[PDB]
Design a protein around this ligand. Structure first.
Ligand SMILES: Nc1ccn([C@@H]2CS[C@H](COP(=O)(O)OP(=O)(O)OP(=O)(O)O)O2)c(=O)n1
Ligand SMILES: OC[C@H]1O[C@@](CO)(O[C@H]2O[C@H](CO)[C@@H](O)[C@H](O)[C@H]2O)[C@@H](O)[C@@H]1O
Ligand SMILES: [Mg+2]
Lengths: 553, 406
DNA sequence: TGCCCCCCCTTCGGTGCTTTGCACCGAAGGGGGGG
């Protein structure tokens, strides 16, 4: 039935009128599907006949539903959505089963005909005008407008959600020791009451919904474990994901690989150790979704590893709020991190991964800090607090980073855990110049308009070099000049540059880069024993810098 | 009483900023606070057909031990119509930074007795999240002058003057400045004497409806140069690049006769003797930097900018300016937290301290250039914020070329 | 031939700098999942 809740007033955007779009052809099974729904929707007051006085229109269709032998009616409101006012969406996130507590008694209910049980603002109805075709031969169609929320209108999800919240609010206040997870039209209801009182509360909640016009079909009233909920399976003491089927293919397209990565990301919330770096590398620089992409050797290996992980059965546990949350992180290589969140050892609440590259140039310590930040945010969302961390980095390593790095940085209460590979700084610049080490004065210049440039150095030991460069930039030649000094120096070197750009990158102790040049410099820094790096201003006649600047021209 | 008609600036729409996640204890506090405010008609439940939003969170002062709701109206204030344009603004008094002690009072609750233009209320919406997204967000908007909105001191201006006249009447040498939800009240009375008319000013206010600042020890920190018996090539290169930077700020600082002590391709560890004429250059340069720069004056029509550098061992340098290299103030903030273990807390406290000094001195907060990754700041700062206002800020990655400010 | 939400990975384009490319960032394309 239609709720007697007050309608939500809605507006077109200012200046705009309503849509005016012709209808298209559908099959005979997709006209009987709708006419069955359409003269029956009219019987229940969901729609009303209109005629030519209303000048608006929008086309209509139907698609099959996972429930077999039921159809879903849909109108293509793309034009109307454009001219309809914005909404503030109240669905802020997706509930997660690792955020649930154990409950003695559990029920899962669906509200039936959810959108069609909520009425639509009187003055807006006429903008929802459509037409029902009937095979497209010998009849043009008859016109209806919606009296309730249409599926396919931009406002329908939010106005339904907000309506459901208002209807549930009396019941939640009345029963504060009953948790109700409300996702769209799906209701999880947990309690610590014996199943007797619990089912009393349930049908009492069902009757409250029914006076407000919301049926709860028995078909979708789950009463026994395992409950099917939000893509998971709720057991009394544990939860699982519903089975994940990966594509298996002789030949792969971009679009297949896109599907594969998405499945693995979804799996990674409970399957520890999933990796997608090498499969996603295949997506780079491609240019059609139907382009065949041959898997690299590294992608096959990564795919096979993920497949082994997926064959093993896994489960999460539920949240015990009387125990700490603990987050443990491991390093996987090539900027990939996996993590587990638990309270008792070897009993995961969930897992995950962090593998974004932020910045052209970074190091493992920064990326570890980002993973920590992503886990901290996810823990606030799911459990409302941050966890204690277990990290594969020594206290000394961290302490040397936050003293030598010029940006404020932090990570919460953490305990070192020895699970190699450990996160470490790969080199450290000397705070002071090195006695007995050679002093290189470096410089590189490029011609803005030519592409041509030079990198070079002079030395307190009389060494000097200039190399020609083609197809380069100002910043590149400066990086190149440092590259050569490192290439030709011993295990210990003092370097003076006039590029604050180059100093900026290297002072941040990067261990990886999207630049091959910066990568080459990093490998040289890692092989050295000591390096002091100094800056001076250019073109002020400073001894050393002046002579090499002299020489690069 | 009657609303004052309020508008956004021409061709701007209202704020549309997503709510960020909150801890259990902040969500509980917001639900307690908003429920009570709903009952008193100060806010009203709204739905999703209002398309505006502004983030909400909560702060608990350690001494107070009670939560304070903080709505981040920075976006809304930028889009709200100027009130100095309509001439309803609050003059800054130059006497405040002269006082021995200044106490901060949170008086935001007085705003809740004045209603807000019904056509403007929708711009004030906010949304309380829920743990593990058990429910959709819950939305309110204001019916009264909101805390944190720049329009509320301006509209309430006429009234707080009436409320404060007897106190000021009676205490002519105490100076009171309203900034947003705050009263800044300074005097020269003795440390425990000053506190007591603080407490009397309170009762006069509680009869309609932080921790002592001390400006005359807000020491300026100038640029200084090392002093040594003996100088390496590297010392002199560092000295030359530092003074070269500083000549963008000061007048007639020269490097010509320190720079040629370095003629030649020399080892960084070689000890170069100072010529008579380099010793001249340097002791000369030392005093140009001794006293402040001549020609730098505050302009109320322009914004204030603040830069901070982490220096280590809990120290933080800062400069406030409006035009580059024309610093109105240069300072050094020192952490007193204890362990020395938290950079983000230190920086958050430093931003509050610097911003407070700008309010006391010029009457408004500066836009900060913060030496931190955006995502490190946003993971933690609200845990350490204690002010009822929030300044503008942006994130910079600037390595030191020189260590100018040490 | 529809709608709304979260996530990850890739690409693109706008902004500001004592720039002439570069690094950063938010939006939008693809995919996963929920209703
Ligand atoms: N593909 C989809 C799926 C759901 N929806 C929305 C989200 S919630 C609302 C549910 O619709 P209904 O309850 O009326 O039909 P259902 O498929 O749920 O069966 P019943 O519950 O038995 O009545 O439809 C949509 O717009 N598009
Ligand atoms: O921290 C920046 C981040 O915060 C948001 C609010 O979520 O913006 C706020 O801070 C900005 C910087 O001062 C203001 O410009 C803005 O008006 C204020 O809401 C995000 O928009 C931004 O990414
Ligand atoms: Mg349903």
């Amino acid at each position: 039935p239609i709720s007697p809740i007050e309608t939500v007033p809605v507006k077109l955007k200012p200046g705009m009128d309503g849509p005016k779009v012709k209808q298209w052809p559908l099959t005979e099974e997709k006209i009987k599907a709708l006419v069955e729904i359409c003269t029956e929707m009219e019987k229940e007051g969901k729609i009303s006949k209109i005629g030519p006085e209303n000048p608006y229109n929008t086309p209509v269709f139907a698609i099959k539903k996972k429930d077999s032998t039921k159809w879903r009616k849909l109108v293509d409101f793309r034009e109307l959505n454009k001219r309809t006012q914005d909404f503030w969406e109240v669905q802020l996130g997706i509930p997660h089963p690792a955020g649930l507590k154990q409950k003695k008694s559990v029920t899962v209910l669906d509200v039936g005909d959810a959108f069609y049980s909520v009425p639509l603002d009187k003055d807006f109805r006429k903008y929802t005008a459509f037409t029902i075709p009937s095979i497209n031969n010998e009849t043009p169609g008859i016109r209806y407008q919606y009296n309730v929320l249409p599926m396919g209108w931009k406002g329908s999800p939010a106005i339904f959600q907000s309506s459901m919240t208002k209807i549930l609010e009396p019941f939640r206040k009345q029963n504060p020791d009953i948790v109700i997870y409300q996702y769209m039209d799906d209701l999880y209801v947990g309690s610590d009451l014996e199943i007797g009182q619990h089912r009393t509360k349930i049908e009492e909640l069902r009757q409250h919904l029914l006076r407000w016009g919301f049926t709860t079909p028995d078909k979708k009233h789950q009463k026994e474990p395992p409950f099917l909920w939000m893509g998971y399976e709720l057991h009394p003491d544990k939860w699982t994901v519903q089975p994940i089927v990966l594509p298996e293919k002789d030949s792969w397209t971009v679009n297949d690989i896109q599907k594969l990565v998405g499945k693995l990301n979804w799996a990674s919330q409970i399957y520890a150790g999933i990796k997608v770096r090498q499969l996603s590398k295949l997506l780079r620089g491609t240019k059609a979704l139907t382009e065949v992409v041959p898997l690299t050797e590294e992608a096959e290996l990564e795919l096979a590893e993920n497949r082994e992980i997926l064959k093993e059965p896994v489960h999460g546990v539920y949240y015990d709020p009387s125990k700490d949350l603990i987050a443990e992180i491991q390093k996987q290589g090539q900027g990939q991190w996996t993590y587990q969140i638990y309270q008792e050892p070897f009993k995961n609440l969930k897992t995950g991964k962090y593998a974004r590259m932020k910045g052209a140039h970074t190091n493992d310590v920064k990326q570890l800090t980002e993973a920590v930040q992503k886990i901290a945010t996810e823990s606030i969302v799911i459990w409302g607090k941050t966890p204690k961390f277990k990290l594969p980095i020594q206290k000394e390593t961290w302490e040397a980073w936050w003293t030598e790095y010029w940006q404020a940085t932090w990570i919460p209460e953490w305990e070192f855990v020895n699970t190699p590979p450990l996160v470490k700084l790969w080199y450290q610049l000397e705070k002071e110049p090195i006695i007995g080490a050679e002093t290189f004065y470096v410089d590189g210049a490029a011609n803005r308009e030519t592409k041509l440039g030079k990198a070079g150095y002079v030395t307190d030991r009389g060494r000097q070099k200039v190399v020609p460069l083609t197809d380069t930039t100002n910043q590149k030649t400066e990086l190149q000049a440092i590259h050569l000094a490192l290439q030709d120096s011993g295990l210990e070197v003092n370097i003076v540059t006039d590029s604050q750009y180059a100093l900026g990158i290297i002072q941040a102790q990067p261990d990886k880069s999207e630049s091959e040049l910066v990568s080459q410099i990093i490998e040289q820094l890692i092989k050295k024993e000591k390096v002091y790096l100094a800056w001076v201003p250019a073109h002020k006649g400073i001894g050393g810098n002046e002579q090499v600047d002299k020489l690069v021209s | 009483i009657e609303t004052v008609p309020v508008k956004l600036k021409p061709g701007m729409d209202g704020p549309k900023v997503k709510q960020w996640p909150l801890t259990e204890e902040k969500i509980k506090a917001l639900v307690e606070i908003c429920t009570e405010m709903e009952k008193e008609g100060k806010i009203s439940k709204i739905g999703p057909e209002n398309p505006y939003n502004t983030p909400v969170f909560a702060i608990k002062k350690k001494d107070s031990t009670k939560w304070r709701k903080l709505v981040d109206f920075r976006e809304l204030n930028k889009r709200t119509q100027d009130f100095w344009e309509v001439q309803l603004g609050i003059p800054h008094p130059a006497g405040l930074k002269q006082k021995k002690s200044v106490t901060v009072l949170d008086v935001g609750d007085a705003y809740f007795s004045v209603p807000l233009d019904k056509d403007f209320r929708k711009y004030t919406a906010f949304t309380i999240p829920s743990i593990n997204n058990e429910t959709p967000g819950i939305r309110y908007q204001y019916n009264v002058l909101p805390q944190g909105w720049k329009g509320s001191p301006a509209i309430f201006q006429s009234s707080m003057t009436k409320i404060l006249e007897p106190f000021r009447k009676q205490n002519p040498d105490i100076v009171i400045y309203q900034y947003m939800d705050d009263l800044y009240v300074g005097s020269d009375l003795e440390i425990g004497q000053h506190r007591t008319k603080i407490e009397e000013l309170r009762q006069h206010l509680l009869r309609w409806g932080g921790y002592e600042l001390h400006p005359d020890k807000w020491t300026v920190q100038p640029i200084v140069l090392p002093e040594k018996d003996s100088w390496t090539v590297n010392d002199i290169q560092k000295l030359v690049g530092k003074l070269n930077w500083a000549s963008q700020i000061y007048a007639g600082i020269k490097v010509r006769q320190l720079s040629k002590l370095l003629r030649g391709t020399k080892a960084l560890t070689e000890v170069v003797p100072l010529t008579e004429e380099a010793e001249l250059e340097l002791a000369e340069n030392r005093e140009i930097l001794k006293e402040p720069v001549h020609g730098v004056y505050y302009d109320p029509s322009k914004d204030l900018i603040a830069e901070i550098q982490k220096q280590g061992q809990g120290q933080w340098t800062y400069q406030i300016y409006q035009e580059p290299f024309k610093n109105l103030k240069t300072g050094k903030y020192a952490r007193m937290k204890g362990a020395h273990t938290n950079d983000v807390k230190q920086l958050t406290e430093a931003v509050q301290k610097i911003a407070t000094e700008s309010i006391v001195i010029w009457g408004k907060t500066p836009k900060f250039k913060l030496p931190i990754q955006k995502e490190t700041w946003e993971a933690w700062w609200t845990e350490y914020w204690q002010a009822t206002w929030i300044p503008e800020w942006e994130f910079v990655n600037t390595p030191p070329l020189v260590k100018l400010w040490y």
